[PDB]
Structure 1
Amino acid sequence: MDARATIPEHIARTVILPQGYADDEVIYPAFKWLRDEQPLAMAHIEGYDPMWIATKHADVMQIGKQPGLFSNAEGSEILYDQNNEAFMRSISGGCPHVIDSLTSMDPPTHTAYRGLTLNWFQPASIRKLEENIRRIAQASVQRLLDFDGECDFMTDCALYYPLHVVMTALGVPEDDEPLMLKLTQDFFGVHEQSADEAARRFHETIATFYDYFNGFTVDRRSCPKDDVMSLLANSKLDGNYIDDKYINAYYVAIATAGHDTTSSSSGGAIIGLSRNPEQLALAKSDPALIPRLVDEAVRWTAPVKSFMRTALADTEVRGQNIKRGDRIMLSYPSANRDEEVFSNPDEFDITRFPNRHLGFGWGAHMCLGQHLAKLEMKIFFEELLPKLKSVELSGPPRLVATNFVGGPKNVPIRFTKA
């Protein structure tokens, strides 16, 4: 219906809708066409707002850099169809954000709330978790090795270690694993009963989680620890504690943001190594390559498929006239296969350097957890790879049919033990 839309319907459907993300050979050719022919253009398909599709690495950085011009707060920062956004608005007091977490905020609010934990998540602070992360990683590796050379790398291994890491970072006890899996896999899981009923279930379930998290907040105000829950519980702004709604959103955001992404990227690494056995040999003879392996797994997997922005003023990008109120989809996968930046970007190559990928985004909201993600993946692969003589896929990987946080959910493998 919007006269400015120039992206062919079939291409627009492929890049916007969830289904195509389940197959690399569906999604990546569509983005290649856009990068070649309509690098920044408008799409409008039935059931969605009109939107610009940012397919180029340069543009995704330019937009992400300027939160004053391209907003997280103003519209939904997640790519929902109109029906789902309206449902979200109806359970969130009219706001297009289900909780008050960092990705829902614009500066200066954003800057203040991110600032509460920014230092904790920097490499020097994160390095103190090394011993704990190594214990957690070894447990997951043992889990895999307990199989007689056959398992699902995701469901039998990679599902676990990153949740345990985010739990240790927060301060959630080991025994609460079931509740944390419910949080990230069930309540905030991918869909893949009336509206009133769904809304009732939502309000009940989130209240249950927030009651649970409130107990930690109270605990840490009397008995401080070096974990994130303690940091936030004991934080003040303008001389007062942060409201429970911001604290609990922060706990949920950290758990959900840090689990699937890391698991998925780990699966991506195993797919890459399975298809490229020489690279497994390389990482085994030179463990100092593992950080480069980790960055390549994140670039190539690109588990976060999109975030959205709303233009707050008329403005120009790649010679296009973006108008106030226009929504923009940021495609991290398309940026990560941009030929102007990467040679042979469809190839998994652990020696790729430099590797200036946007798997963690770029600019004001750039992944808070990026340093924790890189450290835990490094430690995991340091522990796993010496234990493996070989690894191969036993069947096709199954990827999540989503336009938000996807990548591998199931990675059937065979392996021989070193």
Structure 2
Amino acid sequence: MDARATIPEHIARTVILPQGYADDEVIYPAFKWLRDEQPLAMAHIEGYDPMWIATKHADVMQIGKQPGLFSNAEGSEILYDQNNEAFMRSISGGCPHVIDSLTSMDPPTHTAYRGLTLNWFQPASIRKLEENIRRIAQASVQRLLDFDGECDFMTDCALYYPLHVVMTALGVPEDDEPLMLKLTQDFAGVSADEAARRFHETIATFYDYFNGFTVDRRSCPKDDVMSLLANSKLDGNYIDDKYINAYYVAIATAGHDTTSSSSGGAIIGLSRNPEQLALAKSDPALIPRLVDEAVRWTAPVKSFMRTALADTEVRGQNIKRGDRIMLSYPSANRDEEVFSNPDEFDITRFPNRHLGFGWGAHMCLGQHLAKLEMKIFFEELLPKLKSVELSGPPRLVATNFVGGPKNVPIRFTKA
């Protein structure tokens, strides 16, 4: 169906479906064709709604800038097929959002709820976590060095530090690591009535757990995010638990896999470019540039969706009210109008105006926490390594949402 779809079926299938994202050489050439030939065009494949695919850096920014025109709330902000979206709606009392997180909201609601924590996530505030992050980073570096020159960088190291950081930011104690892992890896990881029961049950268990903290921080405040949210008010009243608990989940889930995935990306980049490892070791001031290149090149968030709320024009295309739009951050990050030799990992790349954290109204709340923890982590790691190389191929997550490296088998020499 839909006569406006011009993107060839094989191209559309590659960029929309999950499987392709397990392989850089499948996905990136498909987006390169789109950027060259059909930068912003409509695809319609079986099992999915018709959608515009924003492949250009300029277009992703322009759309992201305008939440009044391009909505997160009206449709699913996550790229589900029609079956899975139907399942989500039936579970969530009709609406296309599992929980009441920031990415489900439009202004002014979004502005209000984002505003509750926005200052806390700014660099000057985040800077106070440096000492705790340093300790956490060193612990992860240490458990890597406990291996005799061989391990999986993801499962044996990078899986842990970003979760512990996000736990420290929230105020979840170290001993709750198993539960938080269940949250991010099991529950939020990649019959019908039975699955619906397990879901409501699981989310209720996590919400009950989180409510314990909300209650605690109203009597015993701390400098963490739970305490900030528990004691926040709007119109002279506490924020409804559903918004608070969604905030805790959104922070933990958005903060863990993305950061681990990008760290893995860095290691892949450095293993394939040993000259750059030597560069980062000789000049540790380059590490923030290394961190930005890792995020650009890895681009662990593959897509978010928008719904057009009115008829409008982007790159001379007539986007109708109700039209769905896929924002491809990976494609924007390899846009040749912005980046020279985009497929190359290069830590000296400056400026590095990538869209790995998105752009506009919903731009990653955690970006400064992410950059700080990755910086600190690599500051601690790189001095301890003489060399690093891949021992086998990296395994990428087969997902069109939050993917990138899941396994990065490596060998290393200790400095």
Q: TM-score range by the shorter chain?
A: over 0.9
SS in 2 for 1:111: helix
Q: Deviations over 1:258-315 (max 9, x none)?
A: 0000000000000000000000000000000000000000000000000000000000
After TM superposition, give the deviation of residue 10 of structure 1 in Å.
0.1
Q: Deviations over 1:182-214 (max 9, x none)?
A: 000000001xxx110000000000000000000
Give the distance between the partners of 2:194 and 2:183, measured in 1 at CA.
19
Q: Which 4+ residue blocks in structure 1 deviate beyond 4 angstroms?
A: none
After TM superposition, give the deviation of residue 238 of structure 1 in Å.
0.2
Verify: 1:317 aligned to 2:317, yes or no. Answer: no
After TM superposition, give the deviation of residue 57 of structure 1 in Å.
0.1
After TM superposition, give the deviation of residue 97 of structure 1 in Å.
0.4
Give the distance between the partners of 1:60 and 1:189, measured in 2 at CA.
26
Q: Deviations over 1:301-354 (max 9, x none)?
A: 000000000000000000000000000000000000000000000000000000
After TM superposition, give the deviation of residue 139 of structure 1 in Å.
0.0
Give the distance between the partners of 2:366 and 2:327, measured in 1 at CA.
19
SS in 2 for 1:329: strand
After TM superposition, give the deviation of residue 45 of structure 1 in Å.
0.1
After TM superposition, give the deviation of residue 216 of structure 1 in Å.
0.1
After TM superposition, give the deviation of residue 116 of structure 1 in Å.
0.2
After TM superposition, give the deviation of residue 151 of structure 1 in Å.
0.1
After TM superposition, give the deviation of residue 113 of structure 1 in Å.
0.1
After TM superposition, give the deviation of residue 78 of structure 1 in Å.
0.2
SS in 2 for 1:376: helix
Aligned residue pair count: 415
Give the distance between the partners of 2:192 and 2:241, measured in 1 at CA.
27
TM-score with structure 1 setting the length: 0.99
After TM superposition, give the deviation of residue 381 of structure 1 in Å.
0.1
Give the distance between the partners of 1:75 and 1:159, measured in 2 at CA.
32
Give the distance between the partners of 2:254 and 2:9, measured in 1 at CA.
32
Q: Deviations over 1:101-153 (max 9, x none)?
A: 00000000000000000000000000000000000000000000000000000
Give the distance between the partners of 2:297 and 2:21, measured in 1 at CA.
14
Give the distance between the partners of 1:177 and 1:61, measured in 2 at CA.
36
After TM superposition, give the deviation of residue 232 of structure 1 in Å.
0.1
Give the distance between the partners of 1:205 and 1:261, measured in 2 at CA.
23
After TM superposition, give the deviation of residue 220 of structure 1 in Å.
0.1
SS in 1 for 2:120: helix
After TM superposition, give the deviation of residue 234 of structure 1 in Å.
0.1
Aligned equivalent of 1:343 = 340
Give the distance between the partners of 2:407 and 2:147, measured in 1 at CA.
16
SS in 1 for 2:83: helix
Give the distance between the partners of 2:97 and 2:157, measured in 1 at CA.
32
- Structure 1: any 5+ residue segments left out of the alignment? none
5 Å-filtered alignment, 1:8-47, equals 8-47=8-47
Q: CA RMSD in A?
A: 0.2
SS in 1 for 2:293: helix
After TM superposition, give the deviation of residue 12 of structure 1 in Å.
0.1
SS in 2 for 1:119: coil
Give the distance between the partners of 1:203 and 1:62, measured in 2 at CA.
37
SS in 2 for 1:151: strand
Give the distance between the partners of 1:106 and 1:148, measured in 2 at CA.
50
Give the distance between the partners of 1:52 and 1:346, measured in 2 at CA.
24
